[PDB]
Amino acid sequence: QQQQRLQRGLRRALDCSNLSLAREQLLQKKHMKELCTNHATEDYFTQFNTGSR
Amino acid sequence: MREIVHLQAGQCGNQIGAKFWEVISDEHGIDPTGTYHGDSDLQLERINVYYNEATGGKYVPRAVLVDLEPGTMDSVRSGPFGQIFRPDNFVFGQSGAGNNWAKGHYTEGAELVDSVLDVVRKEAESCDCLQGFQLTHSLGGGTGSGMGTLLISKIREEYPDRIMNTFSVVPSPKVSDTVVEPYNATLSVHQLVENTDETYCIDNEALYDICFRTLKLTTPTYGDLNHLVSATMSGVTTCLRFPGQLNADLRKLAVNMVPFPRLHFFMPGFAPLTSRGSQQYRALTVPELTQQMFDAKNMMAACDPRHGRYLTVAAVFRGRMSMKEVDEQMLNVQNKNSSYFVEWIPNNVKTAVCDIPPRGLKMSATFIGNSTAIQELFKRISEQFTAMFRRKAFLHWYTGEGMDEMEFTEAESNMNDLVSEYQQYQDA
Numbered sequence A: 001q002q003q004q005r006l007q008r009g010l011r012r013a014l015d016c017s018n019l020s021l022a023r024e025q026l027l028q029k030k031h032m033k034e035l036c037t038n039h040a041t042e043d044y045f046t047q048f049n050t051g052s053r
Numbered sequence B: 001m002r003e004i005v006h007l008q009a010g011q012c013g014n015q016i017g018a019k020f021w022e023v024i025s026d027e028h029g030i031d032p033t034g035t036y037h038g039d040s041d042l043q044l045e046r047i048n049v050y051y052n053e054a055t056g057g058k059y060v061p062r063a064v065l066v067d068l069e070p071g072t073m074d075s076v077r078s079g080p081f082g083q084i085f086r087p088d089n090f091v092f093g094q095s096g097a098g099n100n101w102a103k104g105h106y107t108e109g110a111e112l113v114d115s116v117l118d119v120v121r122k123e124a125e126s127c128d129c130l131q132g133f134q135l136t137h138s139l140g141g142g143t144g145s146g147m148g149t150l151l152i153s154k155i156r157e158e159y160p161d162r163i164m165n166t167f168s169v170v171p172s173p174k175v176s177d178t179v180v181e182p183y184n185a186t187l188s189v190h191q192l193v194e195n196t197d198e199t200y201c202i203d204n205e206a207l208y209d210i211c212f213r214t215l216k217l218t219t220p221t222y223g224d225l226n227h228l229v230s231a232t233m234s235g236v237t238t239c240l241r242f243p244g245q246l247n248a249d250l251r252k253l254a255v256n257m258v259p260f261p262r263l264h265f266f267m268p269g270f271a272p273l274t275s276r277g278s279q280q281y282r283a284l285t286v287p288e289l290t291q292q293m294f295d296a297k298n299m300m301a302a303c304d305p306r307h308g309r310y311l312t313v314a315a316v317f318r319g320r321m322s323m324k325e326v327d328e329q330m331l332n333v334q335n336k337n338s339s340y341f342v343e344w345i346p347n348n349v350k351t352a353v354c355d356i357p358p359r360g361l362k363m364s365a366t367f368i369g370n371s372t373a374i375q376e377l378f379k380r381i382s383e384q385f386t387a388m389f390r391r392k393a394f395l396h397w398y399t400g401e402g403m404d405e406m407e408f409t410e411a412e413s414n415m416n417d418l419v420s421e422y423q424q425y426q427d428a
């Protein structure tokens, strides 16, 4: 009976560590959304009409 | 390690090169006086593809700037970046070329050529492992076409394994500058097919409809057309300078788009081109760079591949991005349209991914694509040669310089089998 209670405790410790990693992986995918987004700054637009030939 | 010696010719070539070197020099963080004041360390490790060393952290390009009148490179020196070029690399004559290619193929340009070969063999043998060269010129001129096809021919007979590449500025077919542009442009193509094995087509009316209708400017200029010639041009050499997840040099571009050595005439394009007032409305993701790059409107040739047939395709991608969305859209454009893609080649598209975005952007994309829709470029230039030629119109300019009339007839006829080559890849 003692070993069965210890086994259940080990599985619940596994669950808690998985929960912490799930929150961190949510953070990682929320960061990874903002790299394939494109955005053009004002430097690219000041590249035009600089030479009046 | 993988050097590029950059060759320019003409008024086009001296004012395309002067703007392209404004693109690399701020890409690598080089100020107008030569030195480096960048912010990262990736802007310094592979800089020797284009720049050399000097004293005091000064980097000077491996360019040679060639012309046949001294007035063209007074503006190339008075530019914002005019004082970064080495003073010996400019080559100029005194008498002009006169929009007559044989003046610069036999008489004027044949005595300027042997002082440039003494220059290009000085900047080629300093390369530790030269990848190859690169030419930008106009077939419609006299210097870059009469003599620029002589400069190709004396570096392909001597260095016959390194790459020769050409960002040619072909005559626009609808509205163009000069009347006698057929002779200088038709005749140089037959002496262009042997000695390059990679060539693009940049028509100046295919740059006007982008910078007016797409970029939505008020007064376009030639300064806003050399931004599109150059942003393509750094976008085909960008894995040679910036590390990425799937590299591709300038040699592996050709290997997947020229399957027979007479098939090297592609059609460039460039995807993230948005108007400033219309920039807020745009969605900006991966499949709205593969959306706009494959429109026939975006294309930098004045010829459409709805009439023709995508023989092969390439694309180079910049920016940190996702290999699932890069690799599914390239599949997605290819599966839908069976009639625009050949048989006898299963997969037609090559992929390369760099990491460093262009200046002022996060992501970009560049296109190079082989077609048999570029023999509709050559039939419209070989209908207006032979219309003018069988009435012998402007002929005394050309056949009075020591040039036989049987020499016309070969590039009138044996050029035209290259036209008849491409329609036999309308069959299988």
Ligand SMILES: Nc1nc2c(ncn2[C@@H]2O[C@H](COP(=O)(O)OP(=O)(O)O)[C@@H](O)[C@H]2O)c(=O)[nH]1
Binding pocket: B009, B010, B011, B012, B015, B016, B097, B099, B138, B140, B141, B142, B143, B144, B145, B169, B176, B177, B178, B203, B204, B207, B222, B225, B226
């Ligand atoms: N697309 C483009 N065309 C140019 C540029 N500069 C000149 N041209 C075109 O090139 C032609 C003039 O070049 P040209 O002086 O005759 O060449 P060269 O004789 O070899 O010096 C004209 O048709 C112009 O429209 C440029 O920066 N971009």
